[PDB]
């Protein structure tokens, strides 16, 4: 499913991401925008045998299990496939753990590159939340 900007913002707010660990809603919508362009189905393959999964491109090395990634930790204790769900529950729950691991939202390279320190509130401007 390809979420709409305001649709995702609303869904992310409903999931407790608005200001989760000091990160405003805009950061999460912006992160989703550059990580997966709002597509819950998105997947990215790397060069270290790991795959990125879903709306927030969660990696198969530390967070989810896909059974083919070396040095896997599965810290979110869930199969990566569950992260390709149409609803964003699984991805959000895992992201909450990630953002709490010690690097904040920096764990998402796309966020760091294109969102961090920008007017992220713009990602929810014309949204009825």
């Amino acid at each position, epitope marked *: 499913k390809v979420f709409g900007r305001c649709e995702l913002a609303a869904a992310m707010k409903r999931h407790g991401l608005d200001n989760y660990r000091g990160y405003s809603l805009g950061n999460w919508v912006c992160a989703a925008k550059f990580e997966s362009n709002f597509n819950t*189905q998105a997947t990215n*393959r790397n*060069t270290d*045998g790991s795959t990125d999964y879903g709306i927030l491109q969660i990696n198969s090395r530390w967070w989810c299990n*896909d*059974g*083919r990634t*070396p040095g896997s930790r599965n810290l979110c204790n869930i*199969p990566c496939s569950a992260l390709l769900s149409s609803d964003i529950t699984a991805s959000v729950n895992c992201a909450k753990k990630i953002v709490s691991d010690g690097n904040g939202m920096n764990a998402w390279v796309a966020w760091r590159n294109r969102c961090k320190g920008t007017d992220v509130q713009a990602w929810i401007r014309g949204c009825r939340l």
Partner: antibody
Amino acid sequence: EVQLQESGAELMKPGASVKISCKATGYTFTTYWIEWIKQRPGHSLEWIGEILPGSDSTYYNEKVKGKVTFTADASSNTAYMQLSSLTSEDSAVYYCARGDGFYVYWGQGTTLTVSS
Amino acid sequence: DIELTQSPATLSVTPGDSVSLSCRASQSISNNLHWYQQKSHESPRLLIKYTSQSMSGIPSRFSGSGSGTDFTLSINSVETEDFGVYFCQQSGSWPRTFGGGTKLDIKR
């Protein structure tokens, strides 16, 4: 205990299409990727693509993308690979394998013969 | 794609002798390289995983080494049952790619 059982040898004429099946058991079917490999004599093993059963997620290697289509039926632990607009270059043995980085569990392979 | 070049293409060895097979990658794949043995009309059998991890149940005579772009498969004390083709395959990137294979025949 993990096992992958593929469909039998196939013969089709060019222009036609075929659907090979890979039924996998002994493990959680929706967690592992199923990867497809093509092997021809005088040719190196070629990775065709992959599908994550039940998630609707796929990935193709264009050498065979506009002509390859993966699908899966979670209710029977079966993954399918469809090849369209067949030509003699498609003649080969096709394998499905569970994605473990390395390939430890292989289907027995299905031989496709494309001829008039 | 990462290209795996296997050298040599064939090998003739007397039982009891020890030999080596080479697989070189066009670009670094760390230790994400695996080795297989394939008999005629059979599915490839995994022998060595992640460069040096011997698959369980596999004869001790099989060893793997290397790192980055140069890998080696060692078959020590070759036995008659060892005839067949051996391949290396990298899982570092997608598409996964395979080496062109090394056919091992028994010298008698």
